[PDB]
Ligand binder design. Structure first.
Ligand SMILES: O=C(N1CCc2cc(O)ccc2C1)C(F)(F)F
Lengths: 229, 10
């Protein structure tokens, strides 16, 4: 139910992971080390976050697993863009890891990704994305992936959840008081951006799967696991 | 396979 759902999402927000720039100047290696060490740690907290979304843990294990494998980079990115929204030309990875767009030139393949994240972040800024809309949109990213039946009432339980979160977003948007027509346009403007997020995610995933092939960076633990696929 | 994910979900 929308007010309570939104409060839950609010209270579910994972902590900021703190990381710092290396002492020495960035190299392609040490930059990817920093961003993957960050991502790995944020993955750990993404799991706890997902478990706090009402109904998530009532889904079958395979369903929880597969939504998470499907959306994790999207969710890392969505949280990154939200942290960066008020800082044009920068990506706020952590309070002490603030990358200028040009620093992406340090790693082959990464500048484009930064540019996509930066443009999506500018689009959110232009729309004046509100904190409560960002909460619903992030939870929608988790809940809105293709499932196509696996071979293992969970899928019905998923639909009900995504419904509730979409309702919660429509309800958040109704608070602005704008015209019916403009409330529709805003919903569409927000949701159309889900594609950009998925598109950047895909480019991020492939970047990391390629780096992992080049041993351009060793990856560990949770991140390694998620990438192994 | 989701050797550690299973772990943290359960
Ligand atoms: O590694 C990449 N990223 C971009 C998104 C992102 C978001 C986080 O919250 C933490 C780390 C990272 C690292 C990618 F390959 F460029 F996509």
């Amino acid at each position: 139910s929308p007010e309570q759902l939104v409060l839950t999402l609010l209270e579910a927000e994972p902590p900021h992971v703190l990381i710092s720039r290396p002492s020495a100047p960035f190299t392609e290696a040490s930059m990817m080390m920093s961003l993957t060490k960050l991502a790995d740690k944020e993955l750990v907290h993404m799991i706890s976050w997902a478990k706090k979304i009402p109904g998530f843990v009532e889904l079958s294990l395979f369903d929880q697993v597969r939504l998470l494998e499907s959306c994790w980079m999207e969710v890392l990115m969505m949280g990154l863009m939200w942290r960066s929204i008020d800082h044009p030309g920068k990506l706020i990875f952590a309070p002490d890891l603030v990358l200028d767009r040009d620093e992406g030139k340090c790693v082959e393949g990464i500048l484009e990704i930064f540019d996509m994240l930066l443009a999506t972040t500018s689009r959110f800024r232009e729309l004046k994305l509100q904190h409560k809309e960002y909460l619903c949109v992030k939870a929608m990213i988790l809940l809105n992936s293709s499932m196509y039946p696996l071979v293992t009432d969970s899928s019905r339980k998923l639909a009900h959840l995504l419904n509730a979160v979409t309702d919660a977003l429509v309800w958040v948007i109704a608070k602005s008081g704008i015209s019916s027509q403009q409330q529709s346009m805003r919903l569409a403007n927000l949701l159309m951006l889900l594609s950009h997020v998925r598109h950047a995610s895909n480019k991020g995933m492939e970047h990391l799967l390629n780096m992992k092939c080049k041993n351009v960076v060793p990856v560990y633990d949770l991140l390694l696991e998620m990438l192994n696929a | 396979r989701h050797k550690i994910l299973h772990r943290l979900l359960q």
